Structures are given as structure tokens and as C-alpha cells.
């Protein structure tokens, strides 16, 4: 099947660390049963409402090819535990 | 959960008991066991002060860490055991230091999870932190009242408190009975509800099962003698022929408040139960 | 069942190259689906609406069986063994 990931990273992350979580977050998808087509970031974008005390944030877009589907669930489990990604949604394609 | 018993005999008609689905091992660590001797409510002088005690199955005390001052060292849950001295299960922890100690088993704690404590630990079940660092609204247990003394406020099975707000040097707390209280912000607590939540649904179902737990029969007052109880006497059955029901020592025993009216700790209690 | 899974099944039951509706090819697939759905209905036991679709399929399997059992008794007595059903 075809999936897609789009997650939000807190703006108060220095660009050294903000380039590290992407390798970490994209690490799991390739580690488990999935393949990533690309991983692009839109950049800073204002939020329509204050999701946390924050008001701004960073955006990301990822495409996948998976069949066992367990990679996505592993991605879901680490998403809430982590304190970096605030909102993330999985869409099927 | 709870294991009901088929009505074989009249003594087994209603008895129910816990099935112990959660205890992992049944061999205590021999290095953390201290002897106990029953006292049966017998006093310093050998007199009997608190009655209806004594004469049960023998036990063995087993030391428990109520302080959790070992800070920053990862601890791992080794097992969940049965402890006869209390209403909650306990867990055996072996830190990477090599030391072993017991802690109270909070609800949701399972073998394998790792426990930190101190001033840099995260917010998860089993972690120990000062009330200073605890975010408001969380559910805690094993509170303490003086800094460094050891956990003393919430300990029984399936009970919990709730951090309610910070007021400078002190922290507001809602205790299990519903009494909102104020305590020092440098005390400690453990996040999460206490484990054995079903301990209160058990039918004893037998007098013998009452006596297996160090309990002795209770005799009413209306069947005593006039010199034995303010109620005893009267031919046939007799009601409470007094102004108010009385304890065996005067001092009315229904609706009569007995807290010390001039206590030092009235100013730390926002509202009672 | 996926589409590709079925085309693997049909190739193991056809009489000639391209039949797709003979009773035995028609029943080889349905038995696979019935077995597949039971393992998906023995976990979520409260899906009452979807369980009815299982009843229709086993009802549609039995009606085809009596077709063979009155058309070619030899063929039907052979199909069961390969497919591992009962009477």
C-alpha cells in the first residue's frame, strides 16, 4: 500500500539538532519493513492556533512503501513518547 | 481478577479470593528478611491495651525502601511478590549498582520496566521526585511529611493522591480521604496509583478465615454485665437506655468529634473530609 | 483475499485452461475465504454484522456441493479429499 507522513517539530530546536531528529525519525521506517522515497521539509510555518505554548513550528513530508505495516505502528509508538514531535498524522495513498 | 468458589459446603458457600494473576515469583530474597513476633495487643507492661488482636499465622517482616534516595542510577523491576504485612503487592528492584531493595508496586508496573529517581527523572510510574519538580495535576502516592524521613502518607492498596497547586514554599495536595492539605515542597512522592486495586472485594466467608489473619472475636456491649460496659444489664433484650451510645469507657461513640481542639497543624489543613 | 492470492488458487483447480465458474473451481476459492474469515472472526467476536457474511458463504458452498453430488458422484467424492472437507 501507499502511505505518507507529515510531522511537526518544535521551533526551539537549533538547526544542529533539527537535522538529527529527521535522521532518527526516518531511521525507524527504513529499519522496519518500509522504504522511504524522500524526506523534504517545508520550513517554518505559522500555526492557525496555539497547539501548545508554541505558536510556530517546522513541517516535514515523507513518502513510504510498506507491506507488513508494522513500521507505521512502531512510528506511532515513538511519536507520543518523544517530546520533539508535537503533531503527526498518517494518510493512506 | 477474583476467583469465586462453587458452593460445596456451607462454609464455602460465599467465600471468594484473589487469584494472584500478577505475582511472578514466590521465593523472597533471603537478605531482606527480618523476624517478627506477634504482640497480640499486649502492652509494654504485659497488659492488654488494644483488643481483638493476636493469634494468627506466623509471618516474617521484609524491609521496604520508603525513601528512594538512590538518585540517578537505573533500577530494573525483577519481580512482583506477595507480602503478608500489607494490602499491596511489592516489587524487587536490582539497580545497576548491584544492590537489591523492595518498593511498593504501583498500578501498571510490570516486570522489565526501568525506574529512575532523583531530580532529573522523567514522569512515569515508579519514578521518585520532589514535589517541587512534580507538574500540577498528576497522581502520586507514597508522600512524605518531613524532608528526608521516608514515604508516609499514601501507601495502602489501590489509593492515590493528586498534586493540586504550588503556593511558594508549600504544595497543596488532595489526600485519599478528601482532605486538602499543605506540605513542604522538598518532600518526595512517587507517580502513579498503588497496585492491588481489587483487595477490597473479597468475602471472608468463614470465621476461621477471619482468625487466620490474627483477629479475635468481638463481643457486643448489650450482652455484657452492668459492671462491664455502660450498656450491659437489663432483663431480656434491652435497648440503649442512655442519652447517647457509649464506648466501654464513657466518651460517647457516635457523632462525637475527638480531634485535639488545640492542635498545631490546623493551619496546614485548608478543608477537612 | 487479495486478487493475486486467488489467481494462485484457481490455477490449481481448473479443468481446462480458462474455466472460472465450474463448481469445483467455484468452491475451491470459497472454502479458502471461509477459512480465512473464521480466523478473522475468532478474534473480534462482537462484529455481528460481518459474521453474517460468513453464513451466506457457507450457505453458498453447501448448495454447490449437492450439485456435484447429483451430477458426478465420482468427481465429488474426489474433490473433498483434495480440498479436505467433510460430508
Amino acid at each position: 500500500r501507499k502511505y505518507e507522513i507529515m510531522y511537526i517539530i518544535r521551533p526551539n530546536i537549533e538547526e544542529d539538532e533539527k537535522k538529527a531528529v529527521v535522521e532518527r525519525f526516518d531511521g525507524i521506517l527504513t529499519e522496519n519493513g518500509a522504504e522511504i522515497i524522500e524526506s523534504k521539509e517545508w520550513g517554518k510555518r505559522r500555526l492557525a492556533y496555539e497547539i501548545n505554548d508554541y505558536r510556530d513550528g517546522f513541517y516535514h513530508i515523507v513518502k513510504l512503501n510498506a507491506d507488513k505495516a508494522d513500521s507505521i505502528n512502531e512510528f506511532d509508538r515513538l511519536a507520543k513518547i518523544s517530546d520533539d514531535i508535537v503533531r503527526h498524522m498518517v494518510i493512506k495513498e | 481478577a477474583i476467583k469465586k468458589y462453587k458452593p460445596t459446603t456451607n462454609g464455602r458457600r460465599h467465600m471468594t479470593s484473589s487469584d494472584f494473576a500478577e505475582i511472578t515469583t514466590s521465593t523472597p530474597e533471603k537478605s531482606l528478611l527480618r523476624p517478627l513476633k506477634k504482640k497480640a495487643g499486649r502492652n509494654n507492661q504485659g497488659k492488654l491495651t488494644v483488643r481483638h488482636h493476636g493469634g494468627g499465622h506466623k509471618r516474617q517482616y521484609r524491609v521496604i525502601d520508603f525513601k528512594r534516595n538512590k538518585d540517578g542510577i537505573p533500577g530494573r523491576v525483577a519481580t512482583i511478590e506477595y507480602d503478608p504485612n500489607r494490602s499491596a503487592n511489592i516489587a524487587l528492584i536490582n539497580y545497576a549498582d548491584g544492590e537489591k531493595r523492595y518498593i511498593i508496586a504501583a498500578k501498571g508496573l510490570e516486570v522489565g520496566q526501568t525506574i529512575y529517581s532523583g531530580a532529573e527523572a522523567d514522569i512515569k510510574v515508579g519514578n521518585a521526585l520532589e514535589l517541587k519538580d512534580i507538574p500540577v495535576g498528576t497522581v502520586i502516592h507514597n508522600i512524605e511529611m518531613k524532608p528526608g524521613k521516608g514515604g508516609q502518607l499514601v501507601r495502602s492498596a489501590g489509593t492515590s493522591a493528586q498534586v493540586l497547586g504550588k503556593e511558594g514554599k508549600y504544595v497543596l495536595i488532595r489526600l485519599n480521604s478528601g482532605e486538602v492539605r499543605m506540605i513542604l515542597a522538598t518532600c518526595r512522592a512517587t507517580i502513579g496509583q498503588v497496585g492491588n486495586e481489587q483487595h477490597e472485594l473479597i468475602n471472608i466467608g468463614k470465621a476461621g478465615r477471619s482468625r487466620w489473619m490474627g483477629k479475635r472475636p468481638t463481643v457486643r456491649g448489650s450482652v455484657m454485665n452492668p459492671n462491664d460496659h455502660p450498656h450491659g444489664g437489663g432483663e431480656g433484650k434491652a435497648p440503649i437506655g442512655r442519652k447517647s451510645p457509649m464506648s466501654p469507657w464513657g466518651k460517647p461513640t457516635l457523632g462525637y468529634k475527638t480531634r485535639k481542639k488545640n492542635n498545631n497543624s490546623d493551619k496546614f489543613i485548608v478543608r477537612r473530609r | 483475499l487479495t486478487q493475486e492470492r486467488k489467481n494462485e488458487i484457481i490455477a490449481e483447480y481448473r479443468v481446462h485452461d480458462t474455466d472460472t465458474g465450474s463448481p469445483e473451481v467455484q468452491i475451491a476459492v470459497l472454502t479458502a475465504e471461509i477459512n480465512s474469515l473464521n480466523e478473522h472472526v475468532r478474534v473480534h467476536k462482537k462484529d455481528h454484522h460481518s459474521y453474517r457474511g460468513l453464513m451466506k458463504m457457507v450457505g453458498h458452498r453447501r448448495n454447490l456441493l449437492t450439485y456435484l453430488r447429483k451430477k458426478d458422484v465420482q468427481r465429488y467424492r474426489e474433490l473433498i479429499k483434495r480440498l479436505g472437507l467433510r460430508r
Partner: protein, 64 residues
Amino acid sequence: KVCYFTSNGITHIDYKDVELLKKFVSERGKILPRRVTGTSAKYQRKLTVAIKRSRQMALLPFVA
């Protein structure tokens, strides 16, 4: 009348095109009805799912 989608050649929907989607939202942030926007009946469901899924991920306000 006349559906913009059914006319202007836009067939698919992507929940990233926030600027394009903003034409179909009111001043207070509510979804416009069909009788005023003129969209076709079929694409209305495509649009309604599109806005909601975006409205969760902070691209558009819930109440403005």
C-alpha cells in the same frame, strides 16, 4: 452556480493546498453550504473531508 472543481479542471485533492481551500471557508471558519458556493454534490464530500483533515493539523483554524 457552476462548480469550480467540475469546471476549472481541478480533479484531485491534496490537504496541503491551504490557499486554494481557503476559498471555501467562511470568515468565522465555518464550512460554506452548497447553495452558496456552487460546488458539485460529489466534490462536496471530497472537500468536506479535505478541510477537516487539514483543520486537525493546524493549517486552518477551528474557530478563527
